[PDB]
């Protein structure tokens, strides 16, 4: 069949995904780190020197990860699955070349390991790179596993993509009753700061830096930065517009109000306000201190005597302020997607390793000074034993930062938490969706909902449905399917190109003509102005399409702010788009024919100028067509596939465009909790928790996404025969009816595997734990507590354990000769089965035991199920097959779901899924429910009619309990249903009496600790409103903490054992019951200087 561009341009998405997988932000960022950023750190910190012994130095020449020069191969890395099993870190050694001087003028190289680098999965240094599923089988790794995380101490940790406002860029915001402040958060490679900028009063404009004592008025700083004419000031910040002149004139007047100014007078004024530098270089306290102040006021570091660049930057800052004061709506949305950047794992580890390497070099220099401070016999030979010992600190910090998520960077000075999370193993989709997950910047004042709303500018860049529920609702975002994140490329060769293309430098530009032409900005900085801004943009775009500049540079033109903007920084979100030229697409299906034939992989569509990346800002300048049919000859691009606006998780939904959006969001939530297949090595894995479906089925109605992400290879769910009808009355309010005898035959049958890890730790007193045990009775059989224990003292593989039995008989020394028993006891309401006992050793010659407890689980009453459309609900009743309604062929539903769930949730996608699945099973083909597409309803109805069924999927059933025809036709067909991780067996908890808090003598607060249910202030309020005083007393005093205290009648102070121990009389001591919380509060108040003396009276005597 001939290739049709309209319906075959979608293959560019699989072409893009082949070389640029879903987990590629992490992958590329980490490869960039380990390949170039490590060299960058080692070349920044290349030499360390000592005050003493000047004829001596240490040089860091080269840096490498995982390879030596001795052999062509890399070093043996313990494979990542073995690292997972043995609770160690998947890391490769960092090798450097050291030039340390010998005392006899000898120069040599070396290959010295300075630590272990935690290697991300499936990166360049990872052993699973370019493996063919056969080496993956040999390495016990899943070929479908996403990669892009770290194994540190055996746990899978992922550095989530970080959202944050773009640095080095001007942001202007207004406010009500306070004034207009607009900042430029500028970050250097060693110093980050924000040049705040607000209007204090009277329309007066000020510059507010942290290092500056008081906000310097704007005319002062403008005069300081070389622009000292006080007319060109108003010309730069005001142009020819009349309103801005009077808006700005007040701070022009102030400039002479204090004292008339030269440049150096303003410079001295600025320098007088600099705070401190930790009292070093005290001899700089002069007019020259302002030079460092202005050098470290922004990213526009000045190394000469020309201040034009910073002057024009501050003038634009001011002019944006003046525009905002003239009228609001000239501000930028802080939630616009074009104003945010995504930090990635490689960048995070780059800065973390830079900090750790600075610490390492400081400590190495300290050790060198301590060694070489000795007067005599300063033998230089083997001066590297210190670094051999000292290599542990880099590894320790690098591992611990990933393990805990707290990143203590002393140099850059902030403490961030939650940088890493444990990779979720509830489902394959759960893991893949934890990949491509974005966490937004904290300290956001969550009381408001600015960065919680969904923006139109995130179309195609962030998934429009995968936003989580409950508390971080709108704070955690997910990447769309077809997306790229730009990488930092050098800006200097683009400035020269801009000058070539007609941009005249600002130093060649005068103030009076600056706001008469468009001004060209490179990363927010005015590099110059150009005539023909649209021609310049077109020529730049032609150069980028012909590959003369990097494909990731973005160029767009703002008309309100007369500017041509060129962005080269990394972290910008972009997506590919077909270029539409002269009203026609550039692909024209010959390229598509080549692409399916094998030629022209996705990169060649970029080299050929047929497809280009667009960031959010260029989309302002673009005009995209969704389809080839509505290409008007004024549009600039054409969507490859519009279903890519949903992420990986939202692609599990059949016909999502037929659903209300909250249903799609809730399915994005529940699909990550669905129970199913995890990996091809799931039975070789030993995880803290794992839910597995016994008989997972691929959905009958699938999408393009689920096969692009291999969801049909490890599915999580089953195609239940569903009758949509009211039945038994046990299906009201999301409750489901489950077929008994479908559960008998294995429908919904899952299992849970839990691991328990113990370490036989050695101690200082040459002593360690042992695992002996299995005592017997007088008849030779073991005691019941050891019924499944084995001679080794570790649970027998395959035997059952009930509650109270031991599967690990560990004993701990009493002087840690004599061992006290500390065995691991199974505490489970239902028995488990030992299916894997792993006996191994950690990296520190310490015995390691891991026991996997497997437990089959029948679907029961209260187990939660969901159906890919946000329609969740527990099993309300399980009924016999004969009581279930049946059709002519005797087909009987596995699940009955209420019709009342459809009208209000408005999930038409679920009905279309039922019909498409029915037509698909009857036709022998899996159907498609892709977003904005899928199998047409008329085709499915035609298939249904051809096979003898109603076109609308409504068959006539008979009642299973009366046998008669149901008076209404029942929507009958297969629907994919997922069993969710929330089972009633792990939620059923009940406590009568038991463990109590030591401090407060109240019931414990955990289900594993036999905890009680807290009766909060709200329930106390409800019981009060009922007027039930005795119930209040019983619930809050009798059944929680009842203490018989001794209270003296003379002094209102609690006694003990009928003794006041303050008057020492025991005559006035009274016995009463009060909350132990009240007793604790009184004893705490007596610890402070409060005496809460209790006065008593008789209840009786009236």
């Amino acid at each position: 069949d001939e290739i049709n561009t309209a319906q075959d341009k979608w293959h560019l998405l699989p072409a893009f995904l082949k070389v640029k997988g879903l987990v590629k932000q992490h992958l590329d960022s980490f490869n960039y780190f380990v390949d170039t950023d490590l060299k960058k750190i080692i070349k920044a910190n290349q030499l360390i020197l000592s005050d003493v012994d000047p004829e001596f130095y240490l040089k860091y020449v080269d840096i490498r990860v995982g390879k030596k020069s001795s052999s062509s191969t890399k070093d043996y890395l313990t494979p990542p699955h073995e690292c997972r099993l043995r609770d160690m870190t998947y890391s490769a050694p960092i090798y450097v070349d050291i030039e340390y001087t010998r005392g006899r003028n000898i120069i040599m190289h070396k290959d010295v390991e300075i630590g272990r680098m935690p290697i991300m999965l499936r990166s360049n240094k990872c052993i699973l790179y370019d493996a063919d599923e056969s080496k993956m089988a040999k390495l016990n790794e899943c070929p479908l596993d996403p990669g892009g995380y770290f194994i540190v101490n055996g746990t899978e940790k992922v550095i989530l993509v970080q959202e944050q406002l773009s640095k080095n860029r001007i942001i202007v915001e207004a406010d009500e009753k306070k004034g207009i402040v607009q900042a430029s958060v500028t970050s250097s490679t060693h110093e980050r700061k924000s040049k705040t900028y607000v209007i204090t009063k009277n329309g007066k404009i000020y510059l507010k830096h942290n290092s500056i004592a008081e906000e310097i008025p704007i005319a002062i700083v403008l005069k300081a930065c070389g622009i000292l004419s006080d007319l060109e000031i108003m010309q730069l910040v005001c142009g020819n517009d009349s309103s801005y002149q009077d808006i700005f004139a007040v701070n022009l007047e102030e400039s002479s109000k204090l004292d008339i100014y030269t440049q150096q007078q303003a410079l001295e004024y600025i320098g007088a306000k600099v705070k401190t530098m930790r009292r070093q270089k005290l001899t700089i306290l002069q007019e020259g201190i302002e030079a460092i102040a202005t050098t470290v006021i922004a990213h526009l570091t000045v190394e000469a005597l020309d201040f034009r660049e910073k002057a024009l930057y501050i003038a634009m800052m001011t002019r944006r302020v003046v525009m905002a004061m003239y009228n609001p709506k000239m501000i930028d949305d802080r939630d616009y997607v074009g104003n945010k950047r995504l930090e990635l794992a490689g960048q995070l580890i780059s800065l973390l390793f830079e900090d750790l390497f600075k610490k390492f070099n400081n400590d190495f220099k300290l050790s060198i000074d301590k060694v070489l401070k000795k007067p005599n016999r300063a033998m230089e030979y083997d001066a590297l034993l210190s670094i051999n010992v000292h290599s542990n600190n880099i590894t320790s910090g690098l591992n611990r930062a990933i393990s805990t998520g707290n990143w203590s960077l002393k140099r850059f000075k902030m403490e961030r938490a939650g940088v890493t999370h444990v990779l979720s193993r509830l489902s394959y989709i759960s893991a893949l969706g934890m990949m491509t997950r974005i966490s937004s910047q904290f300290e956001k004042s969550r009381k408001v909902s600015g960065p919680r709303a969904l923006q139109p500018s995130q179309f195609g860049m962030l998934c429009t449905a995968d936003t989580p529920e409950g508390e971080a609702c709108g704070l955690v975002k997910n990447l769309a399917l077809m997306t790229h994140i730009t990488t930092d490329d050098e800006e200097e060769p683009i400035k020269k190109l801009c000058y070539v293309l007609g941009v005249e430098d600002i130093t060649l530009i005068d103030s009076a003509s600056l706001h008469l032409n468009y001004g060209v900005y490179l990363n927010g900085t005015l590099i110059g102005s150009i005539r023909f801004p649209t021609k310049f943009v077109t020529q730049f775009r032609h150069l980028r399409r012909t590959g003369k500049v990097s494909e990731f540079i973005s160029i767009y033109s703002n008309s309100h702010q007369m500017a041509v903007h060129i962005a080269t920084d990394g972290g910008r979100i972009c997506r590919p788009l077909i270029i539409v030229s002269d009203g026609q697409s550039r692909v024209k299906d010959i390229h598509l024919r080549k692409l399916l034939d094998g030629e022209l992989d996705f990169d060649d569509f970029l080299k050929l100028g047929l497809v280009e990346y667009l960031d959010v800002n260029e989309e302002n300048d673009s005009y995209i067509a969704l389809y080839e049919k509505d290409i008007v000859p004024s549009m600039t691009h054409l969507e490859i596939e519009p279903f890519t606006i949903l992420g990986a998780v939202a692609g599990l939904i059949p016909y999502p465009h037929h659903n209300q959006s909250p249903r799609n969001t809730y399915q994005c939530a529940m699909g990550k909790q669905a129970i199913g297949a995890i990996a091809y090595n799931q039975f070789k894995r030993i995880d803290t928790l794992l839910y597995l479906m016994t008989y997972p089925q691929q959905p009958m109605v699938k999408t393009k996404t689920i096969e692009l992400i291999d969801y049909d290879k490890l599915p999580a769910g089953q195609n239940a025969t569903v009758a949509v009808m009211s039945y038994s009355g046990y299906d009201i309010e999301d409750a489901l009816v489950l077929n008994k005898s479908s559960i008998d035959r294995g429908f919904g049958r899952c299992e849970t595997r839990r691991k328990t890890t113990t370490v036989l730790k050695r101690y200082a007193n040459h002593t360690q734990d042992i695992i002996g045990g299995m005592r017997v009775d007088e008849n030779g059989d073991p005691i019941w507590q050891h019924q499944s224990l084995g001679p080794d003292g570790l649970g027998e593989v395959g035997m059952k354990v009930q509650s109270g039995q031991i599967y690990i008989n560990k004993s701990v020394p009493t002087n840690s000769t004599q061992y006290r028993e500390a065995p691991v006891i199974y505490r489970g309401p239902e028995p488990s089965h030992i299916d894997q006992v792993m006996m191994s050793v950690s990296d520190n010659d310490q015995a390691l035991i891991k026991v996997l407890l497997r437990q089959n689980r029948r679907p029961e009453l209260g187990d939660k199920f969901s159906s890919r459309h946000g329609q969740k609900g527990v099993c309300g009743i399980i009924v016999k097959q004969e009581d279930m309604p049946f059709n002519d062929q005797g087909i009987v539903p596995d699940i009955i779901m209420n019709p009342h769930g459809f009208p209000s949730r408005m999930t038409v996608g679920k009905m279309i899924e039922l019909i498409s699945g029915k037509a698909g099973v009857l036709n022998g083909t899996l159907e498609y429910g892709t977003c904005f597409g899928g199998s047409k309803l008329e085709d499915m109805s035609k298939i249904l009619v051809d096979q003898g069924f109603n076109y609308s999927g409504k068959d006539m059933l008979y009642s299973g309990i009366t046998g008669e025809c149901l008076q209404a036709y029942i929507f009958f067909g297969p629907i994919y249903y997922q069993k969710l991780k929330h089972m009633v067996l792990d939620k059923m908890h009940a406590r009568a009496r038991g463990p109590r808090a030591v401090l407060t003598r109240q019931p414990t607060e955990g289900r594993s600790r036999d905890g009680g249910l807290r009766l909060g202030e709200m329930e106390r309020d409800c019981v009060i409103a009922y007027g039930a005083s005795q119930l209040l007393l019983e619930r809050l005093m009798i059944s929680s903490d009842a203490f018989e205290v001794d209270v003296c009648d003379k002094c209102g102070l609690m006694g003990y054992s009928g003794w006041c121990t303050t008057c020492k009389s025991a005559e006035n001591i009274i016995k009463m019951t009060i909350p132990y919380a009240a007793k604790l509060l009184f004893q705490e108040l007596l610890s402070m200087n409060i005496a809460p003396r209790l006065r008593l009276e008789d209840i009786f005597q009236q």
Binding site: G1027, A1028, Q1030, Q1102
Partner: protein
């Protein structure tokens, strides 16, 4: 500290829900403490249900002391409190 004489009484002659609940609780506690019951059980063992039966027969030997906010009180037997 002064009981209103029975001949005149300002409080309501009807039993409140709180009065009924507290009377049932007190009577059930007494029965659970092996107090004699003045109703025919017909094989009932629950003290609460025995107390409800006595209340239905109006054979509960308790009076309600309703204190007015001014400190006085008027006594109402369970029998005379109409439901």
């Amino acid at each position: 500290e002064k009981a209103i004489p029975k001949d005149q009484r300002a409080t309501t002659p009807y039993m409140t829900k709180y009065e009924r609940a507290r009377i049932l609780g007190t009577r059930a506690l007494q029965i659970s403490m092996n107090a004699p019951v003045f109703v025919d059980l017909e094989g009932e063992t629950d003290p609460l249900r025995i107390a409800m039966k006595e209340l239905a027969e109006k054979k509960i030997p308790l009076v309600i002391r309703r204190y007015l906010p001014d400190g006085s009180f008027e006594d109402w037997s369970v029998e005379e409190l109409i439901v």
